[PDB]
Ligand binder design. Structure first.
Ligand SMILES: [Mg+2]
Ligand SMILES: [Zn+2]
Ligand SMILES: [Zn+2]
Ligand SMILES: [Zn+2]
Lengths: 17, 101, 338, 49, 48, 335, 50, 243, 67, 98
């Protein structure tokens, strides 16, 4: 835990298709 | 250049703005309620409320009536800016508490 | 026969008036209220006086060697393959009848269904009188929709009036959402206090880990169930404080909230929806058929006729009764009224 | 003006199927009364239909 | 009003006669055809 | 009143925000960051791989419920969408089994997959960037053994139970390198999918794509995400003696305690309180206690199905809300 | 890289694979059982996991 | 009725028109007829149309009006304990319309310490939203549960409960919105008075506003029945026993 | 028939709890309530999914047609 | 029993009164043009338009509505005889017409 997973990874699913 | 997302309902619009209904497709109570709250947090806004006219349609009708200081479009744009800022503050605080833990 | 629906007894969304129910989408998505229909069709390859019998020859193809659409799920024997979907218009028994019972007139068994079915059993056998017997079982998985009928063991039936997303449903402190919302106006006039006692008994039962009893002139005592509810942290009367799903605010009334046994009744709007524009007419009367299976029309009876007369709608009378049922352009002699 | 205008509006319009309307008006409330005689408890009157 | 299923609206039709006022609409309905709901199922020509 | 939801014996009061200009003559509570920024606060209570519990403090119900709704219904996750049955001779129907496999939550992180475009042809809709392909090949046979007659089926047969862990990740295309370090497995591998007797077999492949919990429950990433207002118990007058112990019994174990020496009942931990308002039915404590809930203190509990961490789910929800506000802002308004 | 997709009879008594000839009989060859079931088709069936 | 095409397999009707049909959504089925000629279509919608038949011909009393949950929602809004700030009031008015109606917000009933609107003001805006609305309604009505004032000489609106509805210029000056003033069988109905003074279109507009408002308001306010609602108090046990 | 994968109401995965609940009841015999709480089924909807499930698949498998 | 006997009296009376309609000279007649009532109810009034107690106008509500709709504090109240003068200016032409 205590990890900023969202900063580390460049999201793709979250953007609208 | 999305030309279908948010529409201005002209039959519900006044002269010189300050009172307008916007139709926002692919929206529901999630954005409607937060937007209404933020918009009511504006001194010039005298009236704000949304409605999903029918569950079958993914459509949201948000009504803004202001006093004469600003137009409904300006109050809407300010509401969206303020919602973005609020979510940014939430993001910063939450990521900081995650890092600290 | 039923499922223990998480029920919140509250007025909600306005689609739950006069016994209509509010069903939780994503309870339905997870399998709440899911059911299947299984229907049988029986054919006999009968035998004939001229040493002849019916056959199940078929599965013809087009130029490529590809089966035609009506035979898409048929299989070489001419009996619909087990596991395959059959749509409206497709053949699953390819019955050919002799033209002189050599030549075989086609009498295929067509699937005429609004919704597709699946073939799960094809049984080939002979009857006691020596002749082949074919039975094909068609299964149709059904998902609950608007107009499907549910009941709660207390005579409080009602159709599904709206299916709402889980986030729109009210939630308690633990995030539990109702699977069904039962309107509170169905209680005061019907006076089913046993339904409320059942909600409390079932709630205390799940919390305690035990199935409870509602035996006539007995059952689990209400005060003992209240003791269980309080010991588990809940209000004794079964009323939890809920949050609105659409606003997030606490509802100003405490909501009677807990498990209730619900039955999905056989009456499903999928089997009731019927619409006729033009179709078969009776050979005698030339009027639309009387059967929903025969694409029949909806009768406009003497009482509806009385209503339309009371409105004074003469042209509507003509249109409904003569023009759109049986209008005949006859030739009438003006000398003899014949 | 209001009273006179409403009085004028009240007049039965020609063409009205007033007989059929009266038939349904006398036969609709009848579709909610018991075929067998039920009486309030304690009335103890004559058994009148 | 009454809400009518699109499934029964696709079978329950109204026989609209083409005028100079609705010709474009009726052409669009014909193009949509019997399956897309704002469509049409039958055409009766003037002289047939 | 004044930010406190009133918990009465027959009703709930003061549930609306009342923090806007036009509530009162002092047109205060205008929106501004640097007031909300300095008053808002987050207190995280716990963190797991599958559950988080944190306090959004000094935020409005509309925003908190927006995050909750986004988590439940709008945060994307990956689940099986299409099941192709090569062979299914079990008693469980094909569509029933397919629905169950859809309800199996996959441990594939989204943002590794792209959204499927459904405008494309069927032959051109699924790619190595859009889809996870899971196979399942089980054949049940009698155990070539001889234990006690009519024993449990785990040793009378082989492969008598089909678990979710039997679903095998099949890399397609370039997924063999993309997913080499994070092979796709069920989040819950002991999920019982089907039971089969000797001679029965289940052979299938399943295509798994990104989805939205509003589209189907199987796509929801949270086994429940919700909040609750912070309970508040105000003991108006001292409670002492056995009456204090009865008052203590009116609440869950740890909520209130009895001070040693003073023998007065004090509120020990209101968070552990469930608002059953048991105390509000005795007429002995009728004026000695006020129950309430802080209207802008939200105790979020976010338990994830398993594909992603609960804090990630919450951050994605905040980002989704911000993104939809920004998309609306950028969109032009059409007459 | 894209993608594509992804007369046997059973006696109801002894569960034996049978092949019905052209106009022979409708009985099991192992036992005498007179009820035969079509085995599941070989082709693919696609279901939406909903 | 005017057809409205919708996705599911049921005929749907607004609940206000359940009374004339005597329909109750427990598996009830109804028949739909499409007139096929222009003459029949015009006759149907002009003589048998819903707005033209808000009254029964047997007595002239309204028959299309608020049904159960609509009545209860109206009662809970107009209940004397209902107060609303500007935000809640405008959200209620947006629910009442589709968000496409202009509302002239009246001065709040309570101006200090807070700006609060009563529920009767909400329903006054339901009757007459803005100054362009022609509906100016005047009405006196006895609610179905009317206890008289404490003194035999006081006017009826001094009822000890909200037992008496005074409406002046579309403003509800007392009394809750009950069945007797929003339902069937009474000619002092709000919708009946709107009908008689301004026409079926405005009567139906007000009824549509009420239906949409209640359908959205009751779910978010909360209204539930429980075992405690039918549990007798401990004193009544002993009283009824000895009695 | 077979235990649902998810609680109908919350959506929690309960399909991996059926065998372990059966084992907790049979071996090291406990009460149904304590067995349910030991599996993390705290919400009463989740408790219902296991407590009320009827395992009809085991009866349906006695009629195996491919013995 | 009620569902069995629903629409019995309705049908019977429908056969009795089915052909009666109001005529353009305010008479109710059979299809054989025979007079049943020389005027409907002896009044000519439609029961669908009665706002009183089977009387066409609700005087109290109508008076309150008129007072509210024409109200103006900057207006002069007529003397008690002048109210009757205005009333008798309106009524009396219509009274002598008959
Ligand atoms: Mg009914
Ligand atoms: Zn002749
Ligand atoms: Zn055999
Ligand atoms: Zn659950």
């Amino acid at each position: 835990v205590s990890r900023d997973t969202w900063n580390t990874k460049n999201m793709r699913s979250l953007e609208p298709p | 250049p999305d030309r279908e997302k948010i529409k201005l309902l002209t039959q519900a619009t006044s002269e010189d703005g300050t009172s307008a209904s916007f139709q926002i497709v692919e929206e529901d109570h999630t954005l409607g309620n937060a937007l209404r709250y933020v918009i009511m947090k504006n001194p010039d806004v005298e009236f704000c409320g949304y409605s999903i006219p029918h569950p079958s349609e993914n459509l949201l009708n948000i009504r803004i009536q202001t006093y004469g200081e600003t137009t409904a479009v300006d109050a809407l744009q300010k509401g969206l800016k303020d919602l973005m800022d609020l979510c940014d503050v939430v993001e910063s605080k939450f990521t900081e508490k995650i890092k600290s833990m | 026969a039923g499922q223990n629906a998480t029920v919140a007894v509250m007025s909600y969304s306005g689609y739950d008036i006069e016994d209509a129910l509010v069903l939780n989408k994503s309870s339905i998505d997870r399998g709440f209220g899911r059911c299947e229909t299984r229907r049988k069709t029986t054919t006999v390859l009968k035998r004939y006086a001229n040493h002849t019998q019916d056959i199940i020859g078929g599965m013809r193809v087009d130029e490529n060697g590809d089966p035609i659409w009506q035979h898409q799920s048929l299989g070489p024997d001419g009996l619909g393959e087990v596991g395959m979907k059959v749509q409206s218009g497709q053949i699953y028994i390819n019955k050919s009848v002799p033209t002189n019972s050599t030549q075989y007139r086609e009498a295929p068994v067509i699937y005429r269904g609004p919704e597709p079915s699946h073939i799960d059993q094809v049984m080939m056998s002979v009857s006691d009188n020596d002749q082949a017997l074919i039975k094909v079982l068609l299964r149709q998985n059904r998902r609950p929709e608007l107009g499907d009928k549910f009941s709660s063991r207390h005579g409080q039936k009602g159709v599904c009036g709206i299916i709402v997303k889980q986030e729109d449903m009210p939630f308690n402190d633990q995030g539990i959402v109702p699977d069904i919302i039962m309107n509170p106006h169905g209680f005061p006039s019907r006076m089913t206090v046993g339904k409320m006692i059942e909600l409390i008994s079932g709630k205390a039962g799940v919390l305690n880990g035990t199935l409870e009893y509602g035996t006539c002139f007995g059952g689990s005592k209400l005060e003992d169930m209240s003791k269980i509810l309080v010991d588990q942290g809940f209000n004794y009367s079964g009323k939890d404080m809920l949050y609105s799903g659409i606003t997030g605010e606490c509802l100003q009334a405490y909501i009677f909230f807990g498990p209730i046994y619900y039955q999905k009744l056989k009456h499903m709007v999928l089997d009731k929806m019927h619409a006729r524009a033009r179709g078969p007419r009776a050979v005698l009367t030339r009027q639309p058929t009387e059967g929903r299976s025969r694409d029949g029309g909806l009768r406009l009876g003497e009482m509806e006729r009385d209503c339309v007369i009371a409105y004074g709608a003469s042209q509507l009378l003509l249109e409904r009764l003569m023009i759109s049922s049986d209008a005949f352009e006859v030739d009438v002699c003006d000398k003899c009224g014949l | 003006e209001i009273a006179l205008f409403k009085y004028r509006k009240a007049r039965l319009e020609p063409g009205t199927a007033i007989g059929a309307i009266g038939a349904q008006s006398i036969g609709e409330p009848g579709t909610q009364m018991t075929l067998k005689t039920f009486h309030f408890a304690g009335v103890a009157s004559m058994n009148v239909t | 009003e009454v809400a009518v299923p699109d499934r029964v609206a696709k079978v329950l039709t109204y026989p609209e006669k083409v005028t100079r006022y609705n010709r474009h609409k009726l052409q669009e309905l014909i193009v949509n055809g019997p399956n897309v709901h704002p469509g049409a199922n039958y055409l009766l020509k003037r002289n047939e | 009143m004044s930010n406190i939801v009133g918990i009465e014996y027959n009703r709930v009061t003061n549930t609306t925000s009342t923090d806007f200009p036009g509530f009162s003559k002092d047109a205060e509570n205008e929106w501004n960051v640097e007031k909300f920024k300095k008053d808002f606060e987050v207190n995280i209570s716990s963190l797991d791989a599958r559950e988080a519990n944190f306090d959004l403090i000094n935020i409005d119900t509309s925003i908190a419920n927006a995050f909750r709704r986004i988590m439940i219904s709008e945060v994307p996750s990956v689940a099986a969408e299409y099941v192709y049955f090569f062979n299914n001779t079990s008693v469980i129907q094909d569509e029933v089994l397919a629905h169950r496999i859809g309800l199996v939550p996959l441990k594939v992180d989204p943002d590794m997959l792209t959204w499927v475009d459904s405008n494309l042809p069927d032959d051109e809709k699924f790619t190595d960037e859009n889809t996870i392909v899971l196979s399942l090949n089980v054949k049940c046979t009698r155990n070539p053994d001889a234990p006690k007659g009519s024993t449990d089926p785990k040793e009378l047969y082989n492969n008598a139970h089909v678990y979710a862990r039997d679903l095998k990740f099949e890399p397609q295309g370039r997924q063999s390198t993309t997913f080499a370090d994070c092979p796709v497995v069920p989040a819950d591998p002991d999920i019982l999918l089907a039971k089969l007797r000797p001679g029965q077999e289940i052979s299938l492949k399943a295509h798994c794509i990104l989805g939205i919990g509003g589209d189907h429950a199987k796509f929801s990433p949270v086994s429940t995400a919700s909040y609750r207002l912070l309970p508040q118990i105000n003991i108006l007058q001292p409670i002492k003696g056995e009456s204090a112990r009865r008052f203590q019994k009116c609440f869950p174990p740890g909520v209130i305690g009895i001070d040693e020496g003073s023998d007065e009942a004090y509120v020990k931990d209101a968070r552990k309180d469930t608002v059953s308002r048991e105390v509000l039915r005795y007429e002995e404590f009728a004026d000695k206690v006020k129950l309430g809930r802080v209207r802008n203190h939200f105790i979020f509990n976010v338990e994830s199905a398993g594909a992603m961490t609960p804090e990630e789910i919450f951050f994605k929800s905040v980002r989704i809300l911000k993104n939809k506000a920004e998309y609306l802002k950028n969109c032009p308004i059409t007459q | 890289x894209x993608x594509x997709x992804x007369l046997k009879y059973i006696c109801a008594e002894c569960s034996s694979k049978l092949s019905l000839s052209r106009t022979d009989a409708v009985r099991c060859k192992d036992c005498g059982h007179r009820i035969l079931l079509k085995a599941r088709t070989k082709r693919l069936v696609q279901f939406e996991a909903r | 009725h005017y057809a409205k095409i919708r996705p599911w397999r049921t005929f749907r009707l607004n609940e206000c028109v359940c009374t004339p049909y005597n329909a109750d959504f427990d598996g009830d089925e109804m028949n739909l007829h499409v007139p096929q000629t222009e003459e029949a279509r015009a006759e149907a919608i002009n003589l048998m149309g819903v707005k033209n038949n808000l009254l029964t011909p047997k007595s002239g009393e309204p028959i299309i009006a608020a049904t159960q949950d609509f009545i209860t929602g109206s009662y809970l809004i107009s209940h004397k304990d209902s107060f609303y700030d500007r935000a809640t009031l405008t959200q209620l008015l947006s629910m009442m319309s589709d968000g496409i109606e202009h509302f002239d917000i009246p001065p709040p009933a309570i101006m200090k310490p807070y700006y609060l609107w009563t529920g009767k003001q909400v329903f006054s805006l339901l009757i007459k939203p803005n100054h362009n609305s022609p509906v100016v309604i005047n009405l006196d009505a006895k609610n179905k549960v009317f206890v008289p004032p404490k003194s035999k000489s006081l006017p009826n609106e001094m009822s000890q409960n909200d037992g008496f509805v005074i409406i002046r210029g579309s403003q509800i000056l007392s009394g809750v919105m009950d069945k007797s003033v929003l339902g069937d069988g009474k000619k002092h109905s709000v919708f009946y008075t709107i009908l008689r003074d301004y026409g079926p279109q405005e009567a139906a507009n007000a009824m549509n506003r009420m239906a949409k408002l209640c359908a959205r308001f009751l779910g978010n306010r909360g209204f539930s029945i429980g075992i405690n609602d039918v549990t007798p108090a401990d004193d009544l046990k002993q009283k009824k026993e000895e009695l | 028939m077979i235990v649902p994968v998810r609680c109908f109401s919350c959506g929690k995965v309960v399909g991996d709890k059926w065998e372990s609940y059966l084992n907790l009841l049979q071996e090291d015999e406990l009460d149904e309530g304590t067995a349910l709480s030991r599996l993390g089924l705290k919400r009463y909807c989740c408790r219902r999914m296991i407590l009320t499930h009827v395992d009809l698949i085991e009866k349906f498998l006695r009629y195996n047609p491919l013995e | 029993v009620k569902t069995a006997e629903t629409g019995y009296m309705s049908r019977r009376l429908m056969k009795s009164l089915e052909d009666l309609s109001c005529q353009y000279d305010n008479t109710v007649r059979t299809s054989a043009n025979g007079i049943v009532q020389f005027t409907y109810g002896g009044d000519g009034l439609d029961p669908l338009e009665m706002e009183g107690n089977a009387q066409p106008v609700n005087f109290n509500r109508s008076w309150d509505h008129a007072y509210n709709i024409t109200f103006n504090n900057q207006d002069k109240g007529l003397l008690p005889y002048a109210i009757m003068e205005t009333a008798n200016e309106i009524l009396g032409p219509l009274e002598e017409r008959l």
